[model samples]
Target: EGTKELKLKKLSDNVYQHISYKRVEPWGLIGASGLVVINGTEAHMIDTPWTTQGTKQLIEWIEAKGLTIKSAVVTHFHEDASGDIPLLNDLKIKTYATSLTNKLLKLNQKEVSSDEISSNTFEFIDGVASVFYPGAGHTEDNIVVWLPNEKILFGGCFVKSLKNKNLGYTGDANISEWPNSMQKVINRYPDAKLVVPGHGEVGDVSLLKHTQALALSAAAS
Candidate 1:
């Protein structure tokens, strides 16, 4: 995992989102995950990518922007978000994630390490953003971040349209629970025009509804 992290830049008038993807398992391998960067007086980061050269590259890009990453949010307990946390902590960055994610970290302390983690929900006091924990489906700690005025939902793994959703379930997933979780998210963000999944293509509001309908119909069969 010595390779540099890759950063995807997303800019908004009020916020800047940076995506970092780093390899964790198998040395020098590219892990399938990304982090987010929101710009403000101080920058905000989501997920730390994995500990690797990729991460270093990501940090360089962040600093290049002339902003200090003040906070980082771990989308869940998966190694992708928690792997580089030790390094992030060393940089004095505050990391936040669902309380359930923190619990997972506690259970897997042997596998991961962290100093501070929270899950009550995050809201930029400056009125830039807000996030909510919509319960677990893919992982008990999965969270959904929202940009109210923009109608965007950073639904980490909550609403992916990938074909593999029908694949045999992973031990980490609650297949039955997933449907209800998605429904709750849909009901909660009726106006959310976009649902950004942890992996795969970007999604639209009706995409959430479509996923819900398909899940219900499939379960009924």
Candidate 2:
């Protein structure tokens, strides 16, 4: 199995959160977060697990619950974010992503980003969700999502959870730009009460501040 287990937690009337763990060196079984948005019989996703099989499991789970995944937006090009793109594409589910993220996917995927996220701010599902680019921090292509109706901000790997002692995995991160990017998120979605990160326990707006501190420290280090 690519993950220890994949699970979902109900977030709101139409939103469920997915957490799937993968064994990465030093981190061991680290989990990543994504979201399942159900509207009527149609479903949408934000990011994915660290493996396609985990995504497949999640797909099965969604189907079992009588929802069909109509699309998903990739947060970045990292394995945990983009791992399911190929499999999702194979299943004919439309996947959306930034052009930068799509181009980066060429390294491991033959087809990617069926829909292009070309703007810094974009809306989907008839304005139910807002996808935003904070000018790059966690990765060159990283993006965050806003569920306006639910007031749940899906921070992906761009925002750190309160439990995070340090910003994890800076290899592709721009520590210098992290705080500024986060600033945009903070001000743009001031009404967000529940915030979700790529890893660790779900939190609130404090996670954004926590990541700001980490961003400042990591930048200096």
Candidate 3:
């Protein structure tokens, strides 16, 4: 059987998104998948579905809705995105990422095992899209996807998309470089209307500046 089903959230008129907060109980693990459906053409999954069960459920859900997964993008090198790479590779769905991400994937290959790392940026076919490597925040390979016209940023784990501060903890982050990194994002999308951060909820555009201030203040203190 599948784990807890995904919960869908309507962020805008054309963008339909979903998130799976995979719960862990004393007895088992509830896996999940998060997705962003653009228009009605295809969906671009932020991270791959959690597990076999989770991914299967996500695929089923997409199929039922008559949507196809055009691409799956990995935020940073983690099991969340890398774990299901094999399955996605078998299905021939390309995984899009940066060159650094590709290099890191090779490292994972030696340390772990999996050749599903993508070596190029996604050539968005349907809608206007841009992915910029703001700088080192959560990790060196962290990049933010943006919708320039709508001013929406997909900030994966680098900034708090929601109000919850717990997910803001930075592992392997360059504490000092945070400000510049955040500024990169801010300058890139000065008019960002919304931010959809990885592993958290969504919030306003000012969130980018707010998050940077928090990071700088924390580092200084």
Clashing pairs in 3: none
Pairs in steric clash, model 2? none
| Prediction-by-prediction clash tally | 7, 0, 0
Q: 55-136, model 1: which lDDT tens digit per residue?
A: 6677776688787777766677876555667777777777665557777887887234343335456773246557677666
Name the top lDDT candidate.
2
What is the C-alpha lDDT profile of model 2 across 1-221, one tens digit per residue? 22356787898879998888777777667778899988799999998767776788889988998888899998998878877777888889999999888877876554677889888888867768888898778887899999888899999999888988888888888889989999999999899989999988899899999999999988777
Which of candidates 1 and 2 reaches a greater lDDT? 2
Candidate 2 to native Cα RMSD, angstroms: 2.1
Per-residue alpha-carbon lDDT of model 3 for 1-221, expressed as tens digits? 33464566767755655556554434144333344646456776666655666676777777787788766766666565545666766777776666666666677681222223333334343455666777787777777777665667777667764354432446567768877988877877877787876655577776777678777777777
Candidate 1 segments whose C-alpha is farther than 4 A from its true place: 1-4, 14-35, 110-120, 124-126, 162-169, 210-221
Ranking by TM-score: 2, 3, 1
